[PDB]
Design brief:
2 copies of one chain form a homodimer.
Chain A (H helix, E strand, L loop, with lengths): L5 H8 L3 H8 L7 H14 L5 H8 L4
Helix pairs in contact in A: 1-2, 1-3, 2-3
Chain A binds a DNA duplex through α2 and α4.
PDB class: transcription regulator
Keywords: HTH, LAC headpiece
Assembly: tetrameric
Amino acid sequence: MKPVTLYDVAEYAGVSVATVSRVVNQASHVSAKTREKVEAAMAELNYIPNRCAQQLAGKQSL
Amino acid sequence: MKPVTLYDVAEYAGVSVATVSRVVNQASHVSAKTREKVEAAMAELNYIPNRCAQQLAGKQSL
DNA sequence: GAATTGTAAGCGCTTACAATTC
DNA sequence: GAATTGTAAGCGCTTACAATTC
């Protein structure tokens, strides 16, 4: 089973998963317009990230 | 940073990550010899799996 | 021929650097 | 030219099915 994800809102927003992950990661390098671009996307679909995927993927910097 | 992993013990054991993940997953489909094969590998290197990687990858069946 | 092992892809996410934009 | 977005790879793990083994 695959619920809503960054791929979905990224698709919605147009962008990639790299853009959404930024917003999901507190944008920063994502432009204000884009931050809203994906948040709006997240909102419609009801985007909920997974703490594990974030933990695992976030371990790249470790 | 990448510590000991299934890749390591899989390398050691002379198998794949699929074999080790089985043993890591309580072998079952892994032959007794192999179970020992990888456990021995796990032992030398001091293999410690990651609960997240297991949680994430374990969500495949979900 | 059935069980076990391998690719090989993905479970969802993260990111970085270069090209385009200004 | 610098910032932002895209591929694109992988952070560690899981698995399933076919060929070889018996």
